[PDB]
Design a binder for this molecule. Sequence first.
Ligand SMILES: *[C@](=O)([C]([N]C(=O)[C]1[C][C][C]N1C(=O)[C]([N]C(=O)C1=[C][C]=C(C(=O)N2[C][C]O[C][C]2)[C]=[C]1)[C]([C])[C])[C]([C])[C])C(F)(F)C(F)(F)F
Ligand SMILES: [Ca+2]
Length: 240
Amino acid sequence: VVGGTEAQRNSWPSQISLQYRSGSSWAHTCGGTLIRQNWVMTAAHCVDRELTFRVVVGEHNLNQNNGTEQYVGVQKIVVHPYWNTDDVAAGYDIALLRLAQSVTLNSYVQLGVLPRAGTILANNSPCYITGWGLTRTNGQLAQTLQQAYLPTVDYAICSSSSYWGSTVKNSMVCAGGDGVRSGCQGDSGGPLHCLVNGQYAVHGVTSFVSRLGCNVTRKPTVFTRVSAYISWINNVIASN
Ligand SMILES: *[C@](=O)([C]([N]C(=O)[C]1[C][C][C]N1C(=O)[C]([N]C(=O)C1=[C][C]=C(C(=O)N2[C][C]O[C][C]2)[C]=[C]1)[C]([C])[C])[C]([C])[C])C(F)(F)C(F)(F)F
Ligand SMILES: [Ca+2]
């Protein structure tokens, strides 16, 4: 997250850290959202290669014991059928991970609330992106969870030529693009929390940024629109 600030410990209890076995240790590779005691929602591009993964809930500082963490292995990975590894702009960047065990919900570990199917946010809606990604374009990962206010840019504006053009589909959500705040490498798969009628709901799964850099004017961070995949999510969970 570029242009943000450290979040209050455990203030985004649905945020998870997706890590892979790097021989001797574990390395953070993507964010994610806990949606069931044993299911995590993330980006397909985070898990479309054969690696050994684990999920950390109740996390804040990646390098120190905070005393609120729970570590659990990933048992099954379900990538969206239409996803193509080499074509992020086509969309369908979403995947569900079935955990080896159910985590214990408490003050530090909670389920993210999903929007009703088909829900579309008004332009400039108040949202926040959270993650341990780079804090600067070509910078380094954040040790502690960061957050940044990232208001939505509606589809009509986002798909305009001065913005993303045809690269963005209606199955995506754009947010930010002021050249100051944005998602960045390592934030992928994480949540875009939007405040709707007093409650925060996870409207997006962090997907991609421009080749020009993370924080670029008129190049908002692009998210998979969660409300476009509600039926799929429900079907996968029920069949597995
Ligand atoms: C993660 O945290 C990050 N996500 C990414 O890095 C995503 C996944 C694959 C590539 N990507 C990008 O953001 C990159 N964007 C592109 O590759 C890209 C190329 C071209 C176009 C475009 O304008 N098009 C026009 C017509 O032809 C092609 C499409 C759009 C996008 C970017 C880095 C250059 C963060 C969310 C940034 C991660 F991927 F998991 C990571 F941790 F590995 F980084
Ligand atoms: Ca920790």
